Amino acid sequence: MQSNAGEFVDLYVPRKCSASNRIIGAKDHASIPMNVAEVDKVTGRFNGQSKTYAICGAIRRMGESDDSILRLAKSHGIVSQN
Amino acid sequence: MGRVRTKTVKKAARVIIEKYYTRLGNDFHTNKRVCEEIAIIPSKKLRNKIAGYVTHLMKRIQRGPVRGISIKLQEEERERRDNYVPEVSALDQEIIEVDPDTKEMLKLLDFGSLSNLQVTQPTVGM
Amino acid sequence: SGALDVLQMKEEDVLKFLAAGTHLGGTNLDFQMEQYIYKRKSDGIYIINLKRTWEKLLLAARAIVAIENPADVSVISSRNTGQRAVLKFAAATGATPIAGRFTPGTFTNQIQAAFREPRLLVVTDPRADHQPLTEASYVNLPTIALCNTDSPLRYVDIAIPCNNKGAHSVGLMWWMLAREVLRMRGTISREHPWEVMPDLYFYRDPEE
Amino acid sequence: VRMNVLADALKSINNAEKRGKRQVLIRPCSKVIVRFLTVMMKHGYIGEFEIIDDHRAGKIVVNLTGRLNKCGVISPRFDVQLKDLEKWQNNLLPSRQFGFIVLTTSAGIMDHEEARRKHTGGKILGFFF
Amino acid sequence: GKAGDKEWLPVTKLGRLVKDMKIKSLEEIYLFSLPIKESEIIDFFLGAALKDKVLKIMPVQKQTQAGQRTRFKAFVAIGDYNGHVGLGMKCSKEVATAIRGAIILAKLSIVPVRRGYWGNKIGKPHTVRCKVTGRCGSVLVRLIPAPRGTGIISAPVPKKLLLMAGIDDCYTSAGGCTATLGNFAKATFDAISKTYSYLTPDLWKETVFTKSPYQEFTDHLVKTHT
């Protein structure tokens, strides 16, 4: 957040979950980052740079996260036509 | 009557059988004198109890495995059951066929072998 | 799948799926399990798609790879069928098994001596191991498990459908799970027969 | 009955956004709802929206994001005279800095920030933030 | 005579990374929304700006066949004047032990606040970003933003918390039974929490999802550490 100078304030800028577009607080212990491993996709062997996600507790606790994690990987890979 | 054994007996009885399994007999008097040497029990009457329960446990340990304490040879036979069972080496009998509506899935996923057909009657409980 | 046919399901594995009856799934359904099913028979039994099973296997396994420590991907199962299977899993691949009764408080205590902080979980059957799932949402653990048609989804991030009512469906699936993580991380890769088989991930099954 | 159409409309998109959705169905499609959502789209609280056509009155479908917190209606429709304005916007907005009271004027439907630059009072409809 | 402390050997993973000093601020922790399970982590980062303000020391007591039995339940506030506050309750047989139990618990539950401006900028935020609420069982508060130099206009109870928060200007109003102050202060604390859980147009740009400290610093923790 900006000021007169454009100087940035706020002690931490919180992170905003992928499929809910809302922000998770300092205490919120049902919110998970989930690391998918990429592969080279020529031999199907692990190669470094991961795809990382974040999900909030609200969609987790109702049981909607399973669709969200699927759709996120469906707009990328690995998922073709499921 | 009464005289149900306390936890102080049952705690140390298990321990003494685990670490001195070999020394045990199945006679009262021999199992007493062993407990006297491998440990000190500060009373005499207490000693006569802990021996008798050590004896009574050792009867059952020569059958199937006790669920309160472990010995070595049971963990041997555990491992022997849990690394191969004589029932199969084949997966599962190598060829198993399935009935239609499973065949339709396989048709649309490029598979077309090793099937049977039976079109079993309607319906649930009927 | 992703890569064109060097990750896609082979003709071989199809036989194993059908021989272990994984395709079959129970009578009762949930509204989160509607898409995974294709259809019903003429009888009460609903036929899970095996293509849809296969895609979910991969990113599930790829997440088990993505951690840089294999000693803190804690697997859990408490059903008798799922005891022998998980024990070989976490013996072969570096992982931590928690076999039998969970003994609650082991993801939130500072006094218990079985206290652990893992990152992932891999659970068999939500409705036998509901306890670790509830405690996972107090300390930010990602979660994976094996769902059936009638198993509800709640405090799980990804499902891996299966028949799993106590069958060869169980042990086969845990074997396949351990096969994939080695194709990416390990040197077992070649994708042509591995020495270890699914004939010892199956149930103890009391002998003669 | 359905005395006021716009008032029944906003509660759906309010309820839907809370549960976590991104497509809705709102009926029965008034022209008043269209120009409302047009202004609400420019600022960026919702995405593009598709008007289905029927002879009856139509139906509208919306694509939305979590940026919206709540859009409400204010009924019945009171007048504003550009000195009453400051009193309204204090009660109805979380802050001076952002939030947008909407209204209709003879110069068309618009936010309050625009109306002040045209010197036009008029009848207030709702709000959002 | 004899010298040297040795205090705080971590049994917690997060605690060990702080003790080896590869986590450089609490602001990293909050960004991943981790629990904090030890009271020395916070007291390592801070500890020379944290004050305590014991609100009430309240008796409660039940009835048994031998008569009364009374335990003392005290509330204790905590906060430095840069944006971090907390609050805690605890009860025990005696007084001092309950107080010291609460001074530990309040450090554990500490959180940051988000401060903002009135309608214009001149640097250094002095008030609350947006108009928020917070309820605890029929008590609620309506923290309303205020211009500079008005001071905190509130009852005595929330005037403690908001002043420690560094929120120097605020208008408030209460609703319901504020006599039972345990509700009243927990409802204030509830409101003060919501400040970073309220979405504003500033935060609409998308996050970069930087990798976790748990992931990057895992190399030191492959010895026997848990």
CATH fold name of chain C: Rossmann fold
Q: What do we call the CATH homologous superfamily of chain C?
A: Glucose-6-phosphate isomerase like protein, domain 1
Number of strands of chain E: 11
Q: How do the strands line up in the largest sheet of chain C? A: 5-4-6-7-8
Architecture of chain C in CATH? 3-Layer(aba) Sandwich
End-to-end separation of chain E in angstroms reads: 36 Å
Instruction: Quote the distance from N terminus to C terminus of chain C.
Output: 45 Å
- Give the biggest beta sheet of chain C: 5 strands, parallel
Instruction: Strand order, main sheet of chain E: write it out.
Output: 1-2-3-4
Please name the CATH architecture of the largest domain in chain E: 2-Layer Sandwich
Broad structural category of chain E: alpha+beta
Give the SSE order of chain E as H and E letters: HHHEEEHEEEEEEHEEHH
Number of helices of chain E: 7
Number of domains of chain C: 1
Q: Secondary-structure element sequence of chain C?
A: HEEEHEHEEHEEH
Write down the Rg of chain E. Answer: 20 Å
* Greatest interface by residues involved: A-C, 35 and 36 residues
Report the CATH C-level class of the largest domain in chain E.
Alpha Beta
Number of domains of chain E: 2
> Which geometry of chain C do the CA atoms define?
globular
* C-alpha geometry of chain E: globular
PDB class: translation
Keywords: translation initiation, eukaryotic initiation factor 1, eukaryotic initiation factor 1A, eukaryotic initiation factor 3, late-stage initiation complex, translation
Entry title: Mammalian 48S late-stage translation initiation complex (LS48S+eIF3 IC) with beta-globin mRNA
Chain A: 40S ribosomal protein eS21
Structural overview:
It is classed as translation. The entry lists the keywords translation initiation, eukaryotic initiation factor 1, eukaryotic initiation factor 1A, eukaryotic initiation factor 3, late-stage initiation complex, rabbit, translation. Mammalian 48S late-stage translation initiation complex (LS48S+eIF3 IC) with beta-globin mRNA. Chain A is 40S ribosomal protein eS21. Organism of A: Oryctolagus cuniculus. Chain B: 40S ribosomal protein eS17. The structure is cut from a larger assembly and holds chains A (82 residues), B (126 residues), C (208 residues), D (129 residues) and E (226 residues). Chain B has helices at residues 7-19, 28-37, 45-61, 72-81, 103-107. Chain B is an all-alpha fold and 126 residues long. Chain B has a domain at 7-62: Ribosomal protein S17 (Diphtheria Toxin Repressor, domain 2), CATH 1.10.60. Chain C has 208 residues and is α/β, with parallel strands linked by helices. Chain C has a single domain (13-208), classed as Rossmann fold (3-Layer(aba) Sandwich), CATH 3.40.50.10490. Helix content of chain C is 30%, strand content 13%. Chain C has five helices and eight strands, in the order αβββαβαββαββα. Chain C has a five-stranded parallel sheet, with helices on one face. In chain C, β2 (37-40) and β3 (46-48) form a beta hairpin. In chain C, α2 crosses α5 and α3 (81-92) packs parallel to α5. The longest helix of chain C has 17 residues, at 50-66. Chain D has 129 residues and is an alpha+beta fold. The two termini of chain D are 29 Å apart. Chain E has 226 residues and is of the alpha+beta class. Chain E has two domains: 13-112, Double Stranded RNA Binding Domain (2-Layer Sandwich); 115-203, 2-Layer Sandwich (Ribosomal Protein S5, domain 2), CATH 3.30.230.10. Chain E is built from seven helices and eleven strands. Chain E has helices at 13-19, 26-31, 42-45, 95-108, 156-165, 181-193, 213-216, and strands at 51-64, 67-79, 84-92, 111-112, 115-116, 127-128, 132-135, 140-143, 152-153, 170-171, 174-175. In chain E, a hairpin with a 2-residue loop joins β1 and β2 (67-79). In chain E, α5 (156-165) runs parallel beside α6 (181-193). The longest helix of chain E is centred in the middle third of the chain and has 14 residues, at 95-108. Chain E is globular, with a radius of gyration of 20 Å. The two termini of chain E are 36 Å apart. Chains in contact: A-C, A-D, A-E, B-C, C-E, D-E. Chain A binds chain D through residues 19-22, 58-59, 64, and chain D through 20, 65-67.
